[PDB]
Design a protein around this ligand. Sequence first.
Ligand SMILES: NC(=O)CC[C@H](NC(=O)[C@H](Cc1ccccc1)N1Cc2ccccc2C1=O)C(=O)O
Length: 172
Amino acid sequence: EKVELTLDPDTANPRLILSLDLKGVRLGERAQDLPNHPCRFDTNTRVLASCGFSSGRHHWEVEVGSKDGWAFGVARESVRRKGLTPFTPEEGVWALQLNGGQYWAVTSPERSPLSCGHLSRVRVALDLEVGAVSFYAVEDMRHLYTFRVNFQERVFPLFSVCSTGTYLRIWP
Ligand SMILES: NC(=O)CC[C@H](NC(=O)[C@H](Cc1ccccc1)N1Cc2ccccc2C1=O)C(=O)O
């Protein structure tokens, strides 16, 4: 069930910078001049993994920056790439987020504050049989949050970074 992911550069918003190893994402100062690939998020600061899941159970781990500005989890493949989307379950993203110095599950219309400790590394567990996306703090595999979803399509690991001082990294 453990998966080895890499970030898909064709999906990445042109302001993002992906590390050479395709495991890390940060936000650059300027938009790169990149082609208008159909998979590319052209406005929101997102990138997907190159691999998505249609069935079964899979998990991966994400190292998280201490500073505000990231969100990560999963997106349905049909998430709109072109134009400005809301970052919400209805628009096809199921994510945890750090901002305002607080961790959130990005529920809508109101986000859900989590009372977890400081997070360093998070396991994401996607179960398409059960219909759930779950997040655990790695150190004691402490459950943080589950979204229950009836996924009817391929689901991709999702990352977003909208501040220059933070990052996400597929671990290790
Ligand atoms: N990482 C998260 O916490 C998930 C939110 C994230 N937010 C965005 O993409 C927002 C969208 C927006 C918000 C307000 C006005 C206009 C556009 N952007 C785009 C942008 C470009 C360059 C510098 C920063 C930003 C930024 O904040 C997401 O939707 O993936």
